[PDB]
């Protein structure tokens, strides 16, 4: 190793080759009459079938002895189960499927958004890019946010009664002033989560693309790994905040 840091490859086509920005907030692929299927929809579908295949491989000939894919899948699932038990232990299994699928799909979508070809491969006429991250589409993040909002509202009505006097209305004391703010924050929560995930993936895509524009070579190596960490942390925290909001609504 020594002092062989020369960065000779880095000084190759700094900005002459690659396009300046070439980014978009939302793009449409269509391809069928009726519903204009998007490329983000296509990545959602391919990640869905990929996780299905990975699952079937994990559940292929289940054995008393974990090994390989089964071992790591059990690791992730049991670690998540213990982490959710650390917050609340009474409503784990109820929300465990939704929480786990949200986490895993968001993680895999974020990771696929970093693969090569996401901004490179596109069909023609302007070049609409293909292979767009599902989180980069507001239509998906808002869908997860509203699904989580419906789930938390339904479970908070099912448990603790439909009262919500702490947030609906109070007779005397400052709790009347507190209740309205709680309602406003609760309404804010799904939009906040959706914008959080959508932005934290789309801005990462924009950054990796525009860093591929300027000094394309060997500089973005740490930022790609950081973006992997960003996607993993976002996937984890979406699930964690969903469960925490569920627990505090139960309280």
């Amino acid at each position: 190793v020594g002092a062989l840091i020369i960065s000779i490859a880095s000084r190759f086509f700094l900005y002459t080759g690659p396009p300046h920005v070439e980014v978009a907030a939302e793009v449409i692929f269509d391809g069928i009459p009726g519903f204009p299927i998007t490329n983000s929809f296509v990545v959602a579908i391919i990640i869905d079938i990929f996780v299905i295949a990975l699952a079937v491989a994990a559940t292929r000939n289940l054995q008393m002895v974990p090994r390989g894919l089964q071992n790591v899948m059990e690791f992730i699932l049991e670690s998540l189960y213990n982490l959710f038990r650390n917050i609340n232990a009474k409503y784990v299994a109820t929300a465990f499927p939704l929480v786990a699928t949200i986490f895993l799909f968001v993680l895999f979508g974020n990771w696929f958004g970093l693969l090569p070809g996401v901004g490179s491969i596109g069909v023609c006429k302007k070049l609409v890019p293909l292979f767009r991250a599902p989180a980069a589409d507001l239509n998906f993040t808002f869908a997860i946010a509203v699904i989580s909002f419906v789930f938390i509202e339904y479970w908070g009505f099912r448990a603790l009664g439909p009262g919500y006097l702490k947030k609906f209305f109070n007779t005397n004391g400052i709790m009347s002033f507190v209740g309205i703010i709680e309602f406003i924050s609760e309404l804010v929560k799904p939009f906040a989560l959706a914008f959080r995930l959508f932005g934290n993936i789309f801005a990462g895509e924009v950054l990796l693309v525009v860093m591929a524009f300027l000094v394309p070579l060997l500089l973005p190596l740490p930022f790609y790994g950081f973006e992997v960490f960003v996607g993993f942390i976002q996937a984890l925290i979406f699930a964690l905040l969903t469960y925490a909001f569920l627990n505090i609504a139960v309280t």
């Binding site: 939302e26 559940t59 998906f140």
Partner: protein, 51 residues
């Protein structure tokens, strides 16, 4: 432009996603986590039972 029909279509996509992944993995994998926990529990009870 965000289309409500496409929004509901994302909901149907995620419904397919959650249901098929859940049925094919999570209930098998809940059986797996129950297997490890229940089997460790069997080991424990059989331990005090054998002594």
């Amino acid at each position: 432009g965000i289309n409500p029909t496409l929004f509901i279509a994302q909901l149907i996509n995620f419904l397919l996603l959650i249901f098929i992944l859940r049925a094919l993995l999570y209930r098998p994998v809940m059986n797996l986590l129950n297997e490890r926990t229940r089997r460790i529990e069997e080991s424990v009870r059989d331990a005090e039972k054998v002594r």
